């Protein structure tokens with residue numbers, strides 16, 4: 254699977270029927286229709302830089318994995334009663350600065366989007382087990398607006414030269430991804446899914462209202478990553494964001 258014309262988002266329903274489900278992500282957040290929930294507690298993240306493990310080129314994107322054998326790096330608060338264990342973060346981008354984010358706010362598309370994923374370690378004992386549970390995954394989404402260079406992305410960006418082609422991987426250690434989050438953690442939350450196959454509707458989304466910046470050149474670096482295996486003709490990763498999906502009755506709650 255990928256985002257090309259033949260194997261993109263529009264063709265995912267073929268092997269994954271859940272793609273047309275009632276809890277799919279991403280979605281367009283309409284602020285006039287969100288419901289402020291007074292019960293929503295503040296988002297609390299506490300990550301240990303030592304849990305950073307490695308970075309991998311998966312063909313359609315790349316992601317940074319974290320050791321998730323214990324609760325050294327966790328997420329709490331918000332709409333959760335359980336503690337969620339950090340295990341990965343990655344980005345989504347588009348072919349041009351005009352688009353790239355997965356979620357949209359009042360129809361506005363941003364240039365990219367950061368996803369920090371965690372799994373429910375209070376109820377399950379592994380990502381594999383939690384991945385398909387309705388309450389198994391928690392993912393923070395941060396909209397990235399094209400503008401000033403984001404120094405926080407530096408380490409991530411510098412590591413890409415070692416995993417240029419599909420399947421390459423390299424250690425990525427000593428990094429706390431909470432340093433990538435916006436100053437304010439006011440958020441929107443709704444029940445959704447993974448935005449890439451298998452598309453399980455096991456994700457409780459936490460979308461930050463505040464965006465973070467990224468320069469046009471930094472985005473270029475993402476797009477310069479290759480989706481081909483070493484040796485083949487270079488084929489740049491131009492985009493990997495899935496179109497917004499129907500809310501189908503779901504209510505998007507706001508912590509503010």
Ligand SMILES: CC1(C)O[C@@H]2[C@@H](CO[C@@]3(COS(N)(=O)=O)OC(C)(C)O[C@@H]23)O1
Pocket residue numbers: 311313314315316343368370392446447448449450
């Ligand atoms: C690079 C990218 C998109 O992110 C990886 C992998 C497969 O899908 C994901 C999607 O997670 S998401 N986009 O719902 O946060 O689901 C998991 C299993 C959480 O890993 C994510 O590809």
Ligand SMILES: [Zn+2]
Pocket residue numbers: 343344345368448
């Ligand atoms: Zn994602």
